[PDB]
Amino acid sequence: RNFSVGREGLEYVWGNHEPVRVWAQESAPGDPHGWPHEIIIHYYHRHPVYTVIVLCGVALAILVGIASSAACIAKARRDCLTPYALAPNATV
Amino acid sequence: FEHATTVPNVPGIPYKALVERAGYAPLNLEITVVSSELTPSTNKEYVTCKFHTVIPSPQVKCCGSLECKASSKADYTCRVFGGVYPFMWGGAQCFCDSENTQLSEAYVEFAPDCTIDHAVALKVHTAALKVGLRIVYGNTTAHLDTFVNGVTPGSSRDLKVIAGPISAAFSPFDHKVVIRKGLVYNYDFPEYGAMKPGAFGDIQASSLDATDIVARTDIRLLKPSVKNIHVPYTQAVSGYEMWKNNSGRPLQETAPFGCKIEVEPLRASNCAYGHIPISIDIPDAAFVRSSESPTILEVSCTVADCIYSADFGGSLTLQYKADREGHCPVHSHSTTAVLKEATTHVTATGSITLHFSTSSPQANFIVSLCGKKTTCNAECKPPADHIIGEPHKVDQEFQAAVSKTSWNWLLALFGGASSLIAVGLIVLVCSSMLINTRR
Amino acid sequence: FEHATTVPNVPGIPYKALVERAGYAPLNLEITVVSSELTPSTNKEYVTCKFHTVIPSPQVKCCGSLECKASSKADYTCRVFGGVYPFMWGGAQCFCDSENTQLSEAYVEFAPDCTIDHAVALKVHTAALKVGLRIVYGNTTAHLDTFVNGVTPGSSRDLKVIAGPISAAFSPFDHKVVIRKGLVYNYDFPEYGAMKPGAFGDIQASSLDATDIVARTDIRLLKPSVKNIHVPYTQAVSGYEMWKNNSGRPLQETAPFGCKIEVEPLRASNCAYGHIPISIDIPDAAFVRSSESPTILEVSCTVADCIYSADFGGSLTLQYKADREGHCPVHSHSTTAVLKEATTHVTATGSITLHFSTSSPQANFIVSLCGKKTTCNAECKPPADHIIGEPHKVDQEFQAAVSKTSWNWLLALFGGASSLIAVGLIVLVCSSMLINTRR
Numbered sequence: 001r002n003f004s005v006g007r008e009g010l011e012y013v014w015g016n017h018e019p020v021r022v023w024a025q026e027s028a029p030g031d032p033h034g035w036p037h038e039i040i041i042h043y044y045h046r047h048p049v050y051t052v053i054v055l056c057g058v059a060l061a062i063l064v065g066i067a068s069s070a071a072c073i074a075k076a077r078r079d080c081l082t083p084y085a086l087a088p089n090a091t092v
Numbered sequence: 093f094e095h096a097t098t099v100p101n102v103p104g105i106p107y108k109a110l111v112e113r114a115g116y117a118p119l120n121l122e123i124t125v126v127s128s129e130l131t132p133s134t135n136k137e138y139v140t141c142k143f144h145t146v147i148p149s150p151q152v153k154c155c156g157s158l159e160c161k162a163s164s165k166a167d168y169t170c171r172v173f174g175g176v177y178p179f180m181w182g183g184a185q186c187f188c189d190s191e192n193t194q195l196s197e198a199y200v201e202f203a204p205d206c207t208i209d210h211a212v213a214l215k216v217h218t219a220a221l222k223v224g225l226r227i228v229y230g231n232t233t234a235h236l237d238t239f240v241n242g243v244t245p246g247s248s249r250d251l252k253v254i255a256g257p258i259s260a261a262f263s264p265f266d267h268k269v270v271i272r273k274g275l276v277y278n279y280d281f282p283e284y285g286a287m288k289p290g291a292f293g294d295i296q297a298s299s300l301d302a303t304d305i306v307a308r309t310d311i312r313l314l315k316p317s318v319k320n321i322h323v324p325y326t327q328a329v330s331g332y333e334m335w336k337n338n339s340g341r342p343l344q345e346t347a348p349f350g351c352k353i354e355v356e357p358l359r360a361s362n363c364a365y366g367h368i369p370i371s372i373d374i375p376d377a378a379f380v381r382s383s384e385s386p387t388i389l390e391v392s393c394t395v396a397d398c399i400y401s402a403d404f405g406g407s408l409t410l411q412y413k414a415d416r417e418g419h420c421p422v423h424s425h426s427t428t429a430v431l432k433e434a435t436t437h438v439t440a441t442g443s444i445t446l447h448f449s450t451s452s453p454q455a456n457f458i459v460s461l462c463g464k465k466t467t468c469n470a471e472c473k474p475p476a477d478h479i480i481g482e483p484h485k486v487d488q489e490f491q492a493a494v495s496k497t498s499w500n501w502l503l504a505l506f507g508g509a510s511s512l513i514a515v516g517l518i519v520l521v522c523s524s525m526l527i528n529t530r531r
Numbered sequence: 532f533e534h535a536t537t538v539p540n541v542p543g544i545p546y547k548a549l550v551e552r553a554g555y556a557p558l559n560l561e562i563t564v565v566s567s568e569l570t571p572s573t574n575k576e577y578v579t580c581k582f583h584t585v586i587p588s589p590q591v592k593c594c595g596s597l598e599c600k601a602s603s604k605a606d607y608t609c610r611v612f613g614g615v616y617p618f619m620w621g622g623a624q625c626f627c628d629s630e631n632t633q634l635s636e637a638y639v640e641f642a643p644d645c646t647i648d649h650a651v652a653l654k655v656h657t658a659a660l661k662v663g664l665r666i667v668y669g670n671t672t673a674h675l676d677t678f679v680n681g682v683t684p685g686s687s688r689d690l691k692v693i694a695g696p697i698s699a700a701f702s703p704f705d706h707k708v709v710i711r712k713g714l715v716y717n718y719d720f721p722e723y724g725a726m727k728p729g730a731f732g733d734i735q736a737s738s739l740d741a742t743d744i745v746a747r748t749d750i751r752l753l754k755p756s757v758k759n760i761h762v763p764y765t766q767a768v769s770g771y772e773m774w775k776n777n778s779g780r781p782l783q784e785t786a787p788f789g790c791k792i793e794v795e796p797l798r799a800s801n802c803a804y805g806h807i808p809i810s811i812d813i814p815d816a817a818f819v820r821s822s823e824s825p826t827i828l829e830v831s832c833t834v835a836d837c838i839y840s841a842d843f844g845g846s847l848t849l850q851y852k853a854d855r856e857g858h859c860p861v862h863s864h865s866t867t868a869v870l871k872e873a874t875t876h877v878t879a880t881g882s883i884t885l886h887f888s889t890s891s892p893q894a895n896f897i898v899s900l901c902g903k904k905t906t907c908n909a910e911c912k913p914p915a916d917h918i919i920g921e922p923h924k925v926d927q928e929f930q931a932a933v934s935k936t937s938w939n940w941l942l943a944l945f946g947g948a949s950s951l952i953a954v955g956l957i958v959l960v961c962s963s964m965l966i967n968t969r970r
Contacts, residue, residue, distance in 0.1 A: 007451075007484055011350055020481070021350070025401050026488070027478045032453040032495040033471045039498045042474075050490075058505045065512035072516025076523040133654055135574040215572055217656040220722065244725040245747075249601055283659065286683035 096371035110423035117385030120421035120434040126226040130360035132219035141206035143295035151195035154186035158195040165199035166307035178321035260366030264347035274355040275342040294331030386418035395455040398472035402484040404447040411443040420462035429457035451488040453495040535810035542801040549862035556824030559860040559873040568661035569799040576652040580645035582734035590634040593625035604638035605746035617760035650711035652720040658702040691812035699805035703786035733770030825857035834909030841923040843886040865896030890927035
C-alpha cells in the first residue's frame with residue numbers, strides 16, 4: 001500500500017498496535033545548490049506548481065524584456081535615422 | 093521578570109527561547125507541550141441502543157368489545173380484532189366464536205445489554221482547550237496545566253503562566269457527535285423527540301433507565317391469523333443496529349492534526365494545530381546580573397556538513413573567547429533554525445560543539461552564546477531519508493526556502509528581464525531629448 | 532389528507548384557518564399554541580457561592596524548620612514565619628526563645644449554606660423551541676406537544692402535526708448565563724479556572740459537594756504580629772457576594788418578547804416571536820362529502836358598526852340561502868381579519884351575526900361560509916380605550932392600514948402630479964408638432 005506524506009507527517013494504524021507516526025523530509029532529486037537545472041528539478045520535486053509558476057513567470061518576464069527592449073531600441077534608431085534617411089547627401 | 097512568546101502547538105516538541113532581559117544575565121527558556129486536552133462543551137441529548145421489542149401477553153375478551161388506550165411507553169401501539177377465537181395448548185380459549193375480541197399490544201424498551209452497548213448523542217458547541225505545559229528555565233524545571241484562553245493564570249507555585257487564545261478556530265468534533273463503547277463518530281443524529289424508523293435514533297431517552305422513553309419504529313400489528321394465540325407484528329429494523337453496521341470509520345481514526353480522541357469525558361488530545369500565545373512570569377530569583385554570568389568577548393560559527401532534516405542533521409563547532417569558566421546558555425534567535433542544546437559549560441577560551449535542525453537549505457541562522465550573536469551561513473544538504481519517525485522542529489517558509497545561491501540566480505534573471513526594458517526606456521528618453529536638443 | 536399553514540407565534544392566541552379539502556366540504560381549523568417551551572442547550576460550567584475561608588490551626592516546630600509544601604486545596608497559600616513565640620491561654624507555647632518557626636495556613640471551601648445560596652454558570656446555545664398545541668377542527672378537538680424543529684412529528688391521537696423551524700432564530704439567553712435560586716442573569720462570567728479575586732467566580736468547582744475546588748482570592752497571610760497566638764490574614768471580599776450586591780436585575784425583567792424565564796431546566800416560557808410553519812395531516816374521515824354537508828346558494832355581507840382593535844370590536848352579519856341545515860364553517864380568507872366564531876348551525880334560510888377583530892380601519896376582507904366567498908367592506912373606527920388586557924389577534928400591513936378615503940386622497944394627489952407631468956409630455960410633443968406640421 002502506498003501512502004503520501006509531507007512535512008506535516010502521517011500516522012498509520014496497523015493491527016491492534018500503537019499508532020505509528022512518520023514525517024517526510026523535503027528530500028528530492030537534484031540539489032538546491034547544484035547547477036540551475038539541478039535547482040529547478042529539486043524545487044519542482046519539492047513544489048511542482050510553485051516551481052512551474054516561477055519558471056514560467058521568469059521566462060515570460062525575460063521574453064517581454066527582450067521584445068520590449070528590441071522594440072524600444074529599434075524604434076528609437078529608426079526615428080533617429082529618419083532625418084538622415086530623408087535628407088540626401090546628409091551626414092551618414 | 094515577565095516574558096511572553098508564541099509557541100508552536102505540538103506535543104513533545106522542544107520549543108526554545110532566550111529571555112534577553114538585559115538588566116540580568118540571559119536565561120534559557122525551553123517550553124514544551126507535554127500534553128493537551130481539547131475538551132469541548134459536551135452535553136448529553138439522549139441515550140440510544142438496539143431497542144428490545146416487547147409484545148406482552150395479549151388481552152382477549154371472549155364475549156365482548158375491547159378498546160385501545162394511550163400509554164406512556166415509547167411507540168406504544170395497539171390494534172383490536174374480532175372473530176379471533178384464539179387457541180392455546182389446552183385448546184380453544186374462548187366460548188364465543190363471533191364477537192370474541194383480541195387486544196394486541198406492543199411497545200419497546202431498551203435491551204438489557206444496552207447498559208453497555210448504548211450509544212449517546214452529544215452536542216458540542218465549541219472546545220475550550222486545556223494544555224499541560226512543562227517548563228524549564230535556567231537550572232529549574234517545572235510542569236503546569238493551563239486552560240488555553242489567554243485569561244486564566246496557571247500556576248506551578250513558582251511560575252505563573254497565561255496561554256491563549258489559539259489563533260486557529262480548529263475543532264475536530266462536528267456540532268453533532270455520538271459516543272459508542274468509547275468510540276466516537278460525528279453524525280447527523282436527529283434531535284430528542286425526533287425519531288426516524290429504521291435509522292439512527294429509532295429509540296431515544298434521557299437515560300438508559302429513564303421511564304419516559306420515546307421511540308418510533310413503524311411497529312404495526314397484523315391480524316392474528318392462526319389457531320395458536322399469537323400477536324403477529326412487524327417493524328423497521330433497529331435504526332441503531334443498522335447505523336452500527338454502516339457507521340463508517342470512527343473519529344478516533346479520522347480527526348485531523350493527529351488528534352487522539354478519548355471518552356470519559358469526550359476529549360481531543362495531542363492535537364498539533366496552530367500556535368499558543370504564551371506569557372510567563374519567570375521569577376527574578378532565577379536571574380543574575382550579566383556580571384555574574386560568564387560572558388564572551390568574541391564568538392564565531394564554523395558550521396559544516398549540516399543536513400536539513402526533521403532531526404538534528406545540522407552541526408557546528410562554535411569558537412569563542414570568554415571571561416570565565418562556567419555554564420552559559422545558547423540559543424538560535426532566528427526561528428528558521430533551532431539548536432538541540434540550550435546551555436553548555438564554557439571555558440575561558442575554546443569552541444563548543446553543537447547540533448541543530450533547520451528547514452532552510454542553508455545555515456543562514458543567527459546564533460548566540462549567552463549574549464554575543466553571530467550568523468552562520470554554510471549550505472545544508474538534503475538527506476536520502478525521505479521519511480523518518482520524528483516530527484519536524486521548524487516550519488518552512490518561502491521567505492527563505494529558496495537557497496541564496498539559487499535565489500541570486502532568480503534575481504539575476506529578473507535583473508536581465510528588467511534591465512532590458514530599463515535600457516529600452518533610457519534609450520527612448522535619450523532619443524526623445526536628442527530630437528529636441530541637438531536639432 | 533394533509534394541510535399546512537404558517538401560524539403567528541403568540542401564546543394563547545387561537546389562530547384559525549380553513550382547510551379546503553377539494554370535493555369535501557371545508558372544515559374549520561383553529562390552531563392554538565397553549566404554551567411554548569424554548570429550551571436552550573446547556574452544560575454546567577461550575578458551581579460557585581460565598582467562599583468560606585478556612586485557616587486551619589497553625590503548626591509550630593519551635594526549634595527547627597518547617598516545610599512550605601504544596602496541597603491541592605483551593606488557593607492553598609500557606610507560608611512560614613519565624614520568631615512566633617506564641618502565647619496560648621495557658622501561657623508560652625514553644626520550646627525555644629528565638630528559633631520558633633510557625634506555619635500559617637489558609638484555603639477556601641464552599642460555605643455550608645452554599646447548598647442553596649450557590650449559583651451555577653452555564654454556557655447555552657442553539658435553543659430549540661418546544662410548544663404545546665391545542666387543535667380544534669370540526670366537531671373534534673385535540674391537544675399536542677411538539678419540538679418546533681420542522682422535523683419531529685409530535686403526533687397525538689390522529690393529528691400528524693409537524694412544526695417549524697421558527698421563522699426567526701431567537702433566544703433570550705445570551706451564550707453566558709448564571710442561575711441563582713431560580714433567578715437567572717445574563718453575565719459574561721469568567722471561564723472555568725479563570726477565577727479573579729474579588730469578582731464573580733471567586734471560588735469554583737464542578738459540583739458543590741466536590742473536593743475538586745479551585746479558587747483565586749488574593750489571600751495573603753501576615754506575620755503573627757501579636758503575643759497571643761493568631762493567624763492574621765486578609766483577602767478580597769467574596770467576589771460572588773460582591774457580584775450579588777451589583778448583579779444587575781434578572782432576565783425575568785429583561786428578557787424580550789414577554790417570555791417568562793423559568794429554571795429546572797433553564798427554559799423560556801410563553802415566548803412570543805415570529806411565526807411558526809405548521810403542517811397537519813388529517814384523517815379524511817374527519818371531513819364530509821360536499822353533498823352530505825349543507826351548502827349555501829346565495830350569501831351577502833353587511834358589516835355592522837365595527838372598531839379596529841386587538842379585541843373583537845367588529846361585528847358583521849350575513850344573509851344566506853342554503854340547501855339544508857347544518858354546521859357550515861366560517862372563516863376569513865383575508866389575513867388582516869379573523870372571525871371569533873368558527874362554525875354556524877346554518878338553517879335553510881336566515882342570517883347570522885358574527886364577531887370579528889381587525890387591525891385595518893378598512894374592514895375590507897373576504898368572508899367565507901361553507902366555502903362560498905363574500906366580500907365585506909366597512910369603515911371601522913378607533914376604540915375609545917387606549918389600552919386593553921388582550922394582545923392583538925392579528926398583525927397589520929401598512930399597505931392595508933391606509934384607509935379607503937386616505938388612500939383615495941393620496942392617489943388623487945399623486946394622480947394630479949402625474950397628470951401634470953403627462954400634460955408636460957403632451958405639450959413637449961405638440962411643440963414639436965407645431966413646427967413639423969407646418970414646415
